[model samples]
Target: NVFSMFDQTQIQDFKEAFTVIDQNRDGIIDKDDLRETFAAMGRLNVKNEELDAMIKEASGPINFTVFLTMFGEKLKGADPEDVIMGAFKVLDPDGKGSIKKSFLEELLTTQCDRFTPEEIKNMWAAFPPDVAGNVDYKNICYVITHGEDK
Candidate 1:
């Protein structure tokens, strides 16, 4: 079903995202699943109305498949950059807009699409961290989509 609509990368991304969103292991994105997701993003005590809005968007009982379709639809209208930066924002709990390069050096190696030592070396070549060794993750995020153009 997905093959016509998405390439393998899209499919793979959704599977992993769904695995993270569906916390109860029941194979559906229920309120409980969404609650854990929101809470981790640091939004606790979220009402059913909020979670239900996401759930109700999918008329069927929700699974990774349903979740993928919705996210695809959502992305059609939504944006990124500030998004990649948004992700880094979440990582620092939204700090002073600069994060410890050392922390990211560790976090990046272990997290999704992990960098090899050489890749890390290559990254530093172009985007050196702040003078105190804090990485201006926001600035790098802007540079990535904005590139050398800006």
Candidate 2:
């Protein structure tokens, strides 16, 4: 289940992300800043309950250090490569090593753990499907277990 952790580039880019969402020039992030930032990023319908959960989980005033702290504790070492691969493979009975992007989206949103729209968007941003709406699940599982691809 364990493979790799955050790289320096991830830390660097996340700092830039902090700068973007930390609006109001206040060095600290509040609910309003997060709300405004979410809206600016096209997530206008993000509920205040969900938004509050975001900041509520974090410690301190939501500074960069606090941000990194949250991320550090977030990764739960998802699954062993074979475990997730087989799980995903079971999802696709068509015999090809891929699946429909829409079905994958549906499973992610409606299946077990239940990913929200933003979470699904995050997954797509990381590894979107191919042009034919197919997701190369083999590579997907590998990347999930092995940070850098083959």
Candidate 3:
């Protein structure tokens, strides 16, 4: 299983994957990135063994498609969009319509005390490229509440 493959070393791989997916370089992975990554994976439908192999084969930073290639069969049987939406549910912990940037900042800082605000901003920018000049609640809601993850 994907969770079982997560050992100390694999954690680093996850972090790297997270970094790559955090396009804006923001410290968090939001709904947009989740959707894009899942879509790029060409539908999450890999088997457990397949996913484990892919995780093991991951070299350097990997995007969603690479992850998919590794475990496409294990992730099978579920609508790709449903899987992405599931990710959104976990990410949007507050249940307040959107994932809060502040909440993500706290999550990152908790994981790495030295994490800086600029890093968080970069990660955020990666997923929500247009969040810079004017970010409001509506943006979060619109980004998360809609889109089919295709």
Candidate 4:
């Protein structure tokens, strides 16, 4: 059922994303490639151990088929709250629960070439600023998972 939730186009898009990150066109994405890909987005804080943990979930190097299967498996019985918080952990490695707006801007501009400027602008607007002048990640995550009822 979870697998059926993602249509063929979404699956194809994931394959494309995986292919882009595979770097050497090796048909497999390893920790090194992931490191390089994330680094390109100015995300230098990602530790090799973190990458290892992610790779372990895939059972090793990720091929397109395995990548799709992994997504399906991960989504099955997943909690939306946990998923959003998990993403925050990846983006805010220091456990600060917040990330600099510039970091998010750089990621959108440099790493996500598929996104248009308008799309990036809309995403940026979704994140309201906090007292620290950083994006309110926790609030944004809540809004994403629970809808913007507030």
What's the candidate order when arranged by decreasing lDDT?
4, 2, 1, 3
lDDT measured at residue 37 in model 4 versus the true structure, 0 to 100: 93
lDDT value for model 4:
0.74
Which ten residues in a row are the worst by lDDT in model 3? 129-138
lDDT of the structure predicted as candidate 3: 0.53
lDDT of each: 0.73, 0.74, 0.53, 0.74
Clashes of 1: 0
RMSD of 1: 14.7
Q: lDDT score, residue 47, model 3? A: 50
- lDDT tens readout by residue for model 4, 6-104: 666667877898888898888999888898899898898997789988888866558888888888786665345666678778988878757876687
lDDT of 2 at 122: 78
Error of 4 at 59 (Å): 2.3
TM-score of each: 0.46, 0.50, 0.28, 0.50
Q: CA RMSD for every model?
A: 14.7, 9.8, 15.4, 16.0
For model 1, the superposed segments whose C-alpha errors exceed 4 Å read 1-5, 75-150
Model 2 weakest 10-residue run by lDDT: 1-10
What is the model-wide C-alpha lDDT for candidate 2?
A: 0.74
Which residue pairs in candidate 1 have backbone atoms (N, alpha carbon, C) closer than 3 angstroms, thus clashing? Answer: none
